[PDB]
Amino acid sequence: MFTGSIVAIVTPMDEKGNVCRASLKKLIDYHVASGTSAIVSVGTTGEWATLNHDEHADVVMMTLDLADGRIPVIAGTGANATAEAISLTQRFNDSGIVGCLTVTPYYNRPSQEGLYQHFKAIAEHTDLPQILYNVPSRTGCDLLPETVGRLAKVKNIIGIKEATGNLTRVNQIKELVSDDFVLLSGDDASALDFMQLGGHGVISVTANVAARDMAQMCKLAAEGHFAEARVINERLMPLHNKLFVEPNPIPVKWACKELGLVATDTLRLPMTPITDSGRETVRAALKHAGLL
Amino acid sequence: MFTGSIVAIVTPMDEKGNVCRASLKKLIDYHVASGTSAIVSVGTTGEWATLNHDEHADVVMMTLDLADGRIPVIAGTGANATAEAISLTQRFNDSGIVGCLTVTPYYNRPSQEGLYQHFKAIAEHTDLPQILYNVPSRTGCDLLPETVGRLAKVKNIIGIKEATGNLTRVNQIKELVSDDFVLLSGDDASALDFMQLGGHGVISVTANVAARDMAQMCKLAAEGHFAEARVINERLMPLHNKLFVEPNPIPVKWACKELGLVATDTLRLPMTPITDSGRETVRAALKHAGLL
Amino acid sequence: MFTGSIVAIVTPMDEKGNVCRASLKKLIDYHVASGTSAIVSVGTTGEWATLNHDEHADVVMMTLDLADGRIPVIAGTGANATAEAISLTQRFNDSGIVGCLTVTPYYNRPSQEGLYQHFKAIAEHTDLPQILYNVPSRTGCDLLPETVGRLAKVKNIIGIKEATGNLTRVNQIKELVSDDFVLLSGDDASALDFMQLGGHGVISVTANVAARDMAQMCKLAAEGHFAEARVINERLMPLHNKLFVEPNPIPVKWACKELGLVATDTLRLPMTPITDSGRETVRAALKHAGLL
Amino acid sequence: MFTGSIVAIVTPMDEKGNVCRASLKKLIDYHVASGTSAIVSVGTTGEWATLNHDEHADVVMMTLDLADGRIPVIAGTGANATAEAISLTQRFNDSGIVGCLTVTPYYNRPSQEGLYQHFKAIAEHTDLPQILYNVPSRTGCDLLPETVGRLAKVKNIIGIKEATGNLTRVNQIKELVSDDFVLLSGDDASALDFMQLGGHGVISVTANVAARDMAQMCKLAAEGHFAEARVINERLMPLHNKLFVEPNPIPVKWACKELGLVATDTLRLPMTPITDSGRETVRAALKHAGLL
Ligand SMILES: N[C@@H](CCCC[NH3+])C(=O)O
Ligand SMILES: N[C@@H](CCCC[NH3+])C(=O)O
Ligand SMILES: [K+]
Ligand SMILES: [K+]
Ligand SMILES: [K+]
Ligand SMILES: [K+]
Incomplete structure (x- = not known):
């Protein structure tokens, strides 16, 4: 549910940029069969940025309908205005999602005290578990460990998706929070290291x-079998890097199309089609992973 | 109209967080009297991030009404989804604004090709002049000079607000665009240097x-009188820096209230009221400028 | 010998900046009694930067004489000209040191191929084990994992002091080198994490x-008892940070004087005496550690 | 003497790595004929990092001999130990150089107070004019404008080589120093912008x-003719950037050999011979400049 391999699932689209239900069903079945712990619906990789609030709700509800109770769903619910994050969250209360992934305000660069008031207010108006989401390269704001410590005292703020790639954050946060607070990596290339540190x-x-290999790697890491998990990570390392050779989710949507998991690799502007050179790098990564 | 001192005007609010019409009128009269060249309505400083699209439109329309033809008005119109930027823009067509300030997509970090396609599409759905806006510390995206060169070929893309504080960009962009493409600083502390470079x-x-001081500074700069302009800049330098002692527009709103230009210094979460230490810093800077 | 807690020992000085033998003897006895694995003589913390080549040799020989076989000594031997590093190393061949700590060329910013030729040539002209030393914040150059991989194939390049604080480097290097290559942290604040990753x-x-506590922490980390080692690291964390509140070794020399381990806290210009505010921060850290 | 186009001259070498007198003479005649204002002997570009103190002195003395009063000579004299900088400087007293270029201590990262004490002490042991040199990417140390202000009060500290490429520093430093303190760029690609700022x-x-082009560019700048200067700058911009395609002075030495100005392009390790791809890049830039 909030541990192991959690997929930040693509939002598959037809040639017009509308959600492709048939493609989504195939992905969801794939994750259920491959042992994925949960699905993050309309996260970053799900083009949270370019769906409107309504389209967003629809993709989440569709994922919940297709999932049919077989795999937990977490929805992306962040916003850069605290009133808007509160309002959006209300739409998902009692939807069937198990939790919300809520990003630090982007663009407006609030203070730490502002982040604290923001997240505390969101949490106050829902019974849903909240997972905080720190990704400074995208938002311009860095939610620091001291503030995560203050927010972890709020009953339903249950963990953090830490996407800095700065591995010192693991034990800085861990020492300030209770043993039940969940620390999740949001940086695939450093994620094994993140798990190895706690x-x-x-x-x-x-x-x-690579759902099955991710799931096994995370299980090995949780049992302490790091040498074994590292053999898997080494085969996935080209993907961990080359899925970001052009802006995410351009590479991963192309990879999903190439494997046949989705009908088209279409995305919404300002995301553009993958370049020829990008296709070649991604394909080589997929073959390194044994997927083609 | 697109040169000299352009104010990124605050959206003054009441204690509930909604626009205060009497305060806005007072500010606009103040800019008319001070020699300000134009007003950017609902830019970053105007809390574009925390107004919904309807509130944003209402503020722009109210600003145009109150300006009553005495001072040109440029609307903030940026979005991180191309479709939504086109809508937002279409909405101000025939409103009376003289142009739009359109920020690079934020959060989703598109490629340069993506930036080119986003702005080209927006420009194609309007007749209004477009001023590109580059502020990578807020957006996670850096619109490079090469791409500004490509976009400057589109008929109604007419300038750029360069808020990197990287002064080498002035002549990199000038080399690639025509003599009538406008270059405006988005960084107060470096703006006089930016004008001295072209x-x-x-x-x-x-x-x-400090509307009158800023207009006089820019008039002197435009005339080649840099040493006279620099005296005015040194008097304002503590404001140029300390209006960012806490996240913009927290300081400038407090300062506006302290000078009697607005009724309240209220902002929307996740922006927070100014700290005491903040108050003290900004008050010292206002004293140095001779404003209080 | 090349694992566990290794001290980068201060070079204690009298009021004139000359090496204080009596102070050095006290330190060396302290490390022998407290379980330190080895001593790095005239490293960074030993003011390698401001001793001439002769003074340098003398401090190393004095440390070896005082040590009297009770604890291994490693000498700092780096230089930014390959001919000079070869020449300096020859002076220590058969001195009694067990190894050399050799920093990437500073100031001149060579390419990776230049670093490879540099270190390979140094290694070629000695039988002594060489430990490479990467500290980009000081040198302006970053010795990357791929190059460390190529250098690890040289018989007597036996390990690396990685002082970036970038914990991803551990497993990037580890996967390119043999299981006998030693990975040592050069960043006290992240060193437990570095050990936990391998x-x-x-x-x-x-x-x-804090020699005894460092020695116990490193032993616990080597046995896999990370929770236990982290209790010690948490008490030493203020020191790990505040020994760098002013440029190293200003704080640590002041701390050594305050504890009575050395007669004076004098350093060589351009290092200056600790500030009053620095003394207060360092003292508080020492008390947190239970040392005062 | 301390304005216009000053060359940081290469130390041309034979195949063994020692100074080539005939090549140096040829370069110095070339600068006399081209209108270069002064020569910096054994600066960074002159391989200050890889010459020992005697070799360094020999090159400066040989340069003064060959200049034969026709062109002023400034010696590189920096060291990271204050005592050693004072020695090095005392050595050029009454040599015939007109001043010294003294870099901030490298590697040891002193405080601003430490920088103040280092340069003040050096200045006190000579009558030669001192030009401070700030190049933080190489040294790890950033000499800030405030500290430049303090040092500019010392009688014989007369200017600064600002190699940050941060153009805001021009007017920050000008505000704090007298009208006769000299500001020189250390960053070719930004130097015209730097002169346009003051x-x-x-x-x-x-x-x-490109000695003649550079002298003409600087003459036009000094006269206020920036648009004419900028035409010359655009012709040289590919050199300004591609002479750093590999670490300086690897490219410029190759280019000097290719133009017939020196006999060999030999450098000292850890500098490495230019790569083939490098050769091609620099040749294209020399073609663009009209030099070959
Ligand atoms: N700054 C905007 C977020 C844009 C929504 C993403 N397409 C707001 O406050 O709502
Ligand atoms: N750049 C100098 C190093 C200075 C020695 C430290 N005080 C050299 O090549 O030797
Ligand atoms: K909690
Ligand atoms: K245009
Ligand atoms: K080896
Ligand atoms: K002076």
């Missing part, structure tokens, strides 16, 4: 195309 | 509270 | 004043 | 191979 899992792009 | 004006935070 | 020890500033 | 010249890599 993290609990990963919210992953790679998992979209 | 830029044409500034979209300014400091102009909210 | 590093073998630390070349430490903190060890100068 | 700087007085450049210590240039590009001047090694």
Whole structure:
């Protein structure tokens, strides 16, 4: 549910940019069969950025309908205005999602005290578990360990997706929070290292195309079998890097199409079609992973 | 109209967080009287991030009404989804604004090709002049000079607000565009240097509270009188820096209230009220400028 | 010998900046009694930067004489000209040191191929084990994992002091080198994390004043008892940070004087005496560690 | 003498790595004929890092001999130990150089107070004019404008080589120093912008191979003719960038050999011979400049 390999699932689209239900069903079945712990619906990799609030709700509800109770769903619910994050969250209360993934405000660069008031207010108006989401390269704001410590005292703020790739954050956060607070990597390339230092899992792009291997790697890491998990990570390392050779989710949607998991690799502007050179790098990564 | 001292005007609010019409009128009269060249309505400083699309439109329309033809008005119109930027823009067509300030997509970090396609599409769905806006510390995206060169070929893309504070960009962009493409600073502390290098004006935070000084500074710059302009810049330098002692527009709103230009210094979460230490810093800077 | 807690020992000085033998003897006895694995003589913390080549040799020989076979000594031997590093190394061949700590060329910023030719040539002209030393914040150059992989194939290049604080480097290097190559942290604040990911020890500033606790922490980390080692690291964390509140070794020399391990805290210009505010921060760290 | 186009001259070498007198003479005649204002002997570009103190002195003395009063000579004299900088400087007293270029201590990262004490002490042991040199990418140390202000009060500290490429530093430093303190760029690609902001010249890599163009560029700048200067700058921009395609002075030495100005392009390790791809890049840039 909030540990192990969690996929940040693509939002598959037809040629017009509308959600492809048939493609989504195939992905969801794939994750159920491959042992993925949960699905993050309309996260970053799900083009949270370019869906409107309504389309967003629809993809989440569709994922819940297709999932049919077989795999837990977490929805992306972040916003850069605290009133808007509260309002959006209300739409998912009692939807069937198990939790919300809520990103630090982007663009407006609030203070730490602002982040604290933001997240505390969101949490106050829902019974759903909240997972905080720190990704400074995208938002311009860095939610620091001291603030995560203050927010972890709020009953339903249950963990953090830490996407800095700065592995010192693991034990800085861990020492400030209770043993039940969940630490999840949001950086596939450093995620095994993150788990080895005491993290609990990963919210992953790679998992979209290597679900079984991600699931086994995370299970080995949780049991302490790091040498063994590292053999898997070494085969997935080209994917961990090359799925970001052009802006995510351009590479992963192309990989999903190439494997046949989705009908088209279409995305919404300002995301553009993968370049020829990108296709070649991604294909080589897929073959390194044994997927083609 | 697109040169000299352009104010990025605050959206003054009541204690409930909604626009205060009497305060806005007072500010706009103040800019008319001070010699400000134009007003950017619902830019970053105007809390574009925390107004919904309807509130945003209402503020722009109210600003045009109150300006009553005495001062040109440029609307913030950026979005991180191309479709939504086109909508937002279509909405101000025939409103009376003289142009749009359109920020690079934020959060989703598109490629340069993606930036080119986003702005080209927006420009194609309007007749209004477009000023590109590059502020990578907020967006996670850096619109490079090469791409500005490509976009400057589109008929109604007419300038750029360069808020990197990287002064080498002035002549990198000038080399690639025509003599009538406008270059404006988005960084108060470096704006005089930017104009000395060949830029044409500034979209300014400091102009909210030192409108006459800023207009006089820019007039001297445009005339080649840099040493006279620099005396004015040194008097304003503590404001140029300390209006960012806490996240913009927290300081400038406090300063506006302290000077009697607005009724309340209220902002929307996740922006937080100014700290005491903040108050003290900004008050010292206002004293140095001779404003209080 | 090349694992566990290794101290980067201060070079204690009298009021004129000359090496204080009596102070050095006290330190060396302290490390022998407290279980330190080895001593790095005239490393960074030993003011390698401001001793001339002769003074340098003398401090190393004095440390070896005082040590009297009771604890292994490693000498700092780096230089930014390959001919000079070869020449300096010859002076220590058969001195009694067990190894050399050789920093990447500083200031001149060579390519990776230049680093490879540099270190390979140094290694070629000695039988002494060489430990490579990467500290980009000081040198302007970053010795990358791929190059460390190529250098590890040289018979007597036996390990690396990795002082970036970037914990991803551990397993990037480890996967390219043999199981006998030693990975040592050169960043006290992240050193436990470094060991938890697969590093073998630390070349430490903190060890100068908390030798026994560092030695126990490293032993616990080597046995896999990370929770236990983390209790010690948490008590030493203020030191790990505040020994760098002013440039190293200013704080640690002051701490050593305050504890009575050395007669004076004098250093060589351009290092300056600790500030009052620095003394207060360092003292508080020492008390947190239980040392005062 | 301390304005206009100052060349940071290469130390041409034979195949063994020792100074080539005939090549040096040829370069110095070339600068006399081209209008270069002064020569920096054994600066960074002159391989200050890899010459020992005697070799360094020999090159400066040989340069003064060959210049034969026709062109002023400034010696590199920096060291990271204050005592050693004082020695090095005392050595050039009454040599015939007109001043010294003294870099911030490298590697040991002193405080600003430490920088103040280092340069003040050096200045006190000579009558030669001192030009401070700030190049943080190489040294790990950033000499800030405030500290430049303090040092500019010392009688014989007369200027600064600002190699950050951060153009805001020009007017930050000008505000704090007297009208006769000299500001020189250390960054070819930004040097014209630096002079347009109020700087007085450049210590240039590009001047090694485009001496006449650089002197003409600086003459036009000093006269206020920026648009004419910028035409010359655009012709040289590929050199300004591609003379750093591999670490300086690897490219400029190759270019000097290719133009017939020196006999060999030999450098000292850890600098390595230019790669083939490098050769091709620099040749294209020399073609663009009209030099070959
Ligand atoms: N700054 C905007 C977020 C854009 C929504 C993503 N397409 C707001 O406050 O709602
Ligand atoms: N750049 C110098 C190193 C200075 C020695 C430290 N005080 C050299 O090549 O030797
Ligand atoms: K909690
Ligand atoms: K245009
Ligand atoms: K080896
Ligand atoms: K002076």
